[PDB]
Amino acid sequence: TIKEMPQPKTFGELKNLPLLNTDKPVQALMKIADELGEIFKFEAPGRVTRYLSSQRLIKEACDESRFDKNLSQALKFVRDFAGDGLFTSWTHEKNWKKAHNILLPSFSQQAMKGYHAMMVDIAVQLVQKWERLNADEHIEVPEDMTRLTLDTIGLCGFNYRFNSFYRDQPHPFITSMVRALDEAMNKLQRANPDDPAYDENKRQFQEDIKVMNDLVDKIIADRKASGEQSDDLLTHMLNGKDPETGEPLDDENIRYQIITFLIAGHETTSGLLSFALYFLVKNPHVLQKAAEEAARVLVDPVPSYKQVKQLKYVGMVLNEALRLWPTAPAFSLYAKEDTVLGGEYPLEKGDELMVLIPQLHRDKTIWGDDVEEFRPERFENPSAIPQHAFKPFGNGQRACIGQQFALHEATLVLGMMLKHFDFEDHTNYELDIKETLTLKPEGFVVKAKSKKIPLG
Numbered sequence: 001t002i003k004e005m006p007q008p009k010t011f012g013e014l015k016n017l018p019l020l021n022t023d024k025p026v027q028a029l030m031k032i033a034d035e036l037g038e039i040f041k042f043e044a045p046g047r048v049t050r051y052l053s054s055q056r057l058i059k060e061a062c063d064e065s066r067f068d069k070n071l072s073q074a075l076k077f078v079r080d081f082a083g084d085g086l087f088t089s090w091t092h093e094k095n096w097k098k099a100h101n102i103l104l105p106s107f108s109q110q111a112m113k114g115y116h117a118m119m120v121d122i123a124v125q126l127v128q129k130w131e132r133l134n135a136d137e138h139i140e141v142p143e144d145m146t147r148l149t150l151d152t153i154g155l156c157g158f159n160y161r162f163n164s165f166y167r168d169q170p171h172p173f174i175t176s177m178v179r180a181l182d183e184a185m186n187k188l189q190r191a192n193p194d195d196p197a198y199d200e201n202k203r204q205f206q207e208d209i210k211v212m213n214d215l216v217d218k219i220i221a222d223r224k225a226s227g228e229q230s231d232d233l234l235t236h237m238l239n240g241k242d243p244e245t246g247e248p249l250d251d252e253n254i255r256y257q258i259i260t261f262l263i264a265g266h267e268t269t270s271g272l273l274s275f276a277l278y279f280l281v282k283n284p285h286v287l288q289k290a291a292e293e294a295a296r297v298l299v300d301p302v303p304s305y306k307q308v309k310q311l312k313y314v315g316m317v318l319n320e321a322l323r324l325w326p327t328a329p330a331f332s333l334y335a336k337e338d339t340v341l342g343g344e345y346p347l348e349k350g351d352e353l354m355v356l357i358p359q360l361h362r363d364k365t366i367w368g369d370d371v372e373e374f375r376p377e378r379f380e381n382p383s384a385i386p387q388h389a390f391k392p393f394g395n396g397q398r399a400c401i402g403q404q405f406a407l408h409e410a411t412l413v414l415g416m417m418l419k420h421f422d423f424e425d426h427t428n429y430e431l432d433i434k435e436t437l438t439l440k441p442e443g444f445v446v447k448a449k450s451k452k453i454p455l456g
């Protein structure tokens with residue numbers, strides 16, 4: 001039967017729009033999903049979307065013959081500085097497929113062998129920072145994980161050192177990037193954006209864009225000027241030719257790719273490490289098991305690529321953190337033709353869906369009753385997981401190109417953290433999830449006690 005879709009509470013002419021007038025929209029949408037179930041309609045003046053939460057329906061939304069990636073309003077606002085890089089381009093734009101074909105070999109599991117040593121450089125700085133803490137100082141976890149992740153993508157991506165472990169104030173590029181991202185997010189719940197009240201925002205936006213463009217174009221120019229070949233994405237993009245068109249990326253697009261990778265390598269990836277460490281300190285038996293793996297595998301002063309691959313349980317820890325709090329929590333699709341979703345909901349060509357990943361990852365039909373428990377063991381036998389049940393990296397040809405990079409970095413860093421330190425949840429931290437572009441455990445702090453194992 002053709003079933004009428006649930007809808008959350010309305011506000012007259014504003015429809016559902018005020019429900020997202022909140023600093024925690026994803027968590028609000030999760031509560032609505034708990035009340036309304038696997039799908040609900042969300043209307044606002046001039047737009048309708050449908051939010052999906054069940055594996056049953058998301059497995060169909062993940063059919064690329066029926067649905068393609070949509071640019072959400074969030075992605076549209078980011079496109080003002082991320083342009084037609086991979087993240088903010090439509091599948092049908094020529095620059096999408098070109099960049100996809102050129103960049104895929106730079107992001108493969110195999111290509112991680114090449115980035116491994118630069119990743120180690122940044123992880124060693126993190127370990128050394130923590131070794132150098134005085135007794136009863138503490139660690140600001142998201143803050144340090146972001147220093148690591150941002151620096152790792154800068155170094156591996158374009159041989160640039162943000163030197164984040166040398167600073168309290170972020171590098172000028174970062175300042176502008178974070179403020180552009182914040183601005184892009186603010187625009188989502190901003191009525192009358194054309195109001196002259198927001199004159200100053202617009203001017204600040206344009207300054208931040210200029211900062212970002214100037215530094216990246218200059219890095220681009222300098223590399224071409226020097227002609228040096230490096231272990232980095234910038235080299236692969238200057239050299240690469242798309243097999244299909246035979247064309248290279250132009251300098252403007254390369255800039256957008258760089259800005260894109262820096263956005264991703266910032267709080268999106270550091271979020272994974274932060275949530276992983278949160279769950280470990282709140283689950284001491286899991287921490288112990290992971291620590292025993294790190295001690296057994298990481299037998300050398302500095303981890304090898306092969307050793308990181310051996311950290312199976314650490315990999316499961318990361319997957320279980322991705323299950324509960326995926327740091328890129330939603331993505332958008334549109335129907336390529338008229339179609340019926342789940343045998344019950346007719347859609348017209350162009351109709352949009354949002355996949356609410358955290359809610360997908362709580363589907364009791366897939367995971368069982370214990371959905372709120374942190375149990376990395378759920379990931380021991382990945383073949384048993386039904387199709388499209390676990391989607392922290394999105395879907396299909398438009399899935400995260402950075403997934404292997406993010407997981408290698410995370411596994412290496414968490415491995416080393418677990419080898420070098422015992423951790424204390426010294427404040428009995430109460431989880432508070434701050435929502436920006438991404439999700440993070442705000443104010444999460446720990447004490448680390450060195451196990452006194454050398455890096456030399």
Ligand SMILES: CC(C)C1=CC2=CC[C@@H]3[C@](C)(CCC[C@@]3(C)C(=O)N[C@@H](Cc3c[nH]c4ccccc34)C(=O)O)[C@H]2CC1
Nearest residue numbers: 020025026072073074075078188189329330331354437438
């Ligand atoms: C850039 C990438 C990393 C992101 C992707 C996102 C996708 C869905 C977003 C997001 C989680 C931010 C919170 C709003 C939400 C859930 C959304 O549904 N937004 C819809 C619905 C919506 C909210 N406000 C709007 C204003 C106009 C039009 C649509 C909307 C949208 O963006 O389209 C957001 C985080 C940032």
